[PDB]
Design a protein around this ligand. Structure first.
Ligand code: HEM
Ligand SMILES: COc1ccc(C(=O)O)cc1
Ligand SMILES: [Cl-]
Length: 393
């Protein structure tokens, strides 16, 4: 019954061309058994969406990577939000939700939009740019660290620190073991910046620490919640903006549609998150025996969810392999779904929308011109280099 697959969804060969293996994942059955990591997988939209939306049965407090925190020591002290279940999750979730609320976004949106317009104007002076280094990375680096209230020095650690955190969800392969062996200087940098004296007034970090004054969180919790924004808040949006530029470069007809109606910017960014799914996978662990995909899975079992595959599952999406900036994207799982659904999603959408808006208004063509190089990571999907030529409007 439950079919076996030898597919290693954490291997270099899979990252370099995942779609034929994702389709085998889906077609083999609603639940698969991965022999490479002795773990159950669900790759269809129906199972992934159901598991995200039953956190009681499929918990996050035993870890959302392969490692079971009941059985093995976590590689770092657990996140208070990502690796917690309700009710322990609920208070820190409510705190970060207020820190990153629609009201907060309104207060920072003009400066984010101005930085994205200035960036696109500067890139158009050079013409030949790397859409990763000069855009997908440079743009969030120019707005997010400042929005957090970080000091200038040490910011070069932010991307490798996120790369470590996202590799650490994976199985114990070489990407994970190498990242953990090199982790100490990145972790020392982030640990210092999570402290209250180091976070400038008015930014997200100081706003988090302001909740210690009323007692909503303790002095020990506050630096761990700042740590969640420094683990997830930059490299995700780097890879989301990168996906969107890549999609627009490969689908020239969709770029023209966006130029013809720039109000499509926010949806063209949502559709890039669905299409590429920058965060490809998370796990859950069962807290009871449960029927999943017609099979009775025992209590205590890891289940790997393939969010990228759910987002491309033809049982749910029409022409899922096409980038379509007017697709109805509501329901995609690129930001997760339910109680843990991305608490930073308004920040990611803000950055995505204002950058795509600047591109829609200022650029007439995006042509790939030189070797595209993939970056490999156990959880994040994206490119290391995307050289392009931008033609001004
Ligand atoms: C395109 C960009 C992004 C993508 C694709 C993404 C993806 C995800 C996904 C799939 C989850 C669900 C985790 C789960 O169910 O276990 C999540 C949660 C989370 N995200 Fe995002 N994210 C992005 C941007 C951001 C940003 C900008 C921030 C912060 C400023 C952020 C902070 C977090 C945090 C702290 C959680 C844990 C929420 C919880 O457990 O309740 N993310 N995100
Ligand atoms: C979506 O990826 C992450 C990674 C880490 C954290 C965290 O450290 O809380 C949250 C979400
Ligand atoms: Cl850490």
């Amino acid at each position: 019954t439950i079919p076996h697959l030898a597919i290693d969804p954490f291997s270099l060969d899979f990252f370099d061309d995942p779609y034929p293996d994702q389709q085998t994942l889906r077609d083999a059955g609603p639940v698969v058994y991965l022999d490479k990591w002795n773990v159950y997988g669900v790759a269809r939209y129906a199972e992934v969406h159901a598991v995200l939306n039953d956190p009681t049965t499929f918990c996050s407090s035993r870890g959302v990577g392969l490692s079971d925190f009941k059985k093995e020591k976590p590689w770092r002290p657990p996140s208070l939000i990502l690796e917690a279940d309700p009710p322990a999750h609920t208070r820190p979730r409510a705190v970060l939700s207020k820190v990153l609320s629609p009201a907060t976004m309104k207060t920072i949106r003009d400066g984010f939009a101005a930085a994205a317009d200035a960036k696109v104007d500067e890139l158009l002076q050079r013409g030949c740019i790397d859409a990763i280094a000069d855009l997908a990375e440079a743009y969030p680096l120019s707005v997010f660290p400042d929005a957090m209230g970080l000091k200038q020095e040490g910011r070069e650690h932010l991307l490798p620190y996120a790369g470590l955190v996202f590799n650490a969800f994976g199985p114990p392969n070489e990407l994970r073991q190498t990242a953990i062996e090199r982790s100490a200087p990145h972790q020392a940098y982030v640990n210092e910046q999570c402290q209250r004296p180091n976070l400038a007034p008015g930014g997200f970090g100081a706003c988090i620490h302001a909740f210690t004054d009323t007692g909503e969180i303790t002095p020990d919790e506050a630096p761990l919640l700042v740590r969640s924004l420094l683990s997830a808040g930059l490299d995700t949006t780097v890879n989301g903006i990168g996906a969107a530029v890549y999609c627009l470069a490969r689908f020239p007809g969709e770029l023209q549609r966006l130029r013809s109606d720039p109000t499509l910017a926010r949806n063209a960014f949502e559709e890039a998150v669905r299409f590429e799914s920058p965060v490809q996978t998370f796990f859950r662990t069962t807290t009871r025996e449960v029927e999943l995909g017609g099979a009775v899975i025992g209590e205590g079992e890891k289940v790997l969810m393939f969010l990228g595959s759910a987002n491309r599952d033809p049982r749910r999406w029409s022409d899922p392999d096409l980038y379509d900036i007017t697709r109805k994207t509501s329901g995609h799982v690129g930001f997760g779904s339910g109680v843990h659904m991305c608490v930073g999603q308004l920040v990611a959408r803000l950055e995505g929308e204002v950058m795509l808006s600047a591109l829609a208004r200022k650029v007439a063509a995006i042509d790939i011109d030189g070797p595209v190089k993939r970056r490999f990571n156990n959880t994040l999907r994206g490119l290391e280099s995307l050289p392009v030529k931008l033609t001004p409007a």
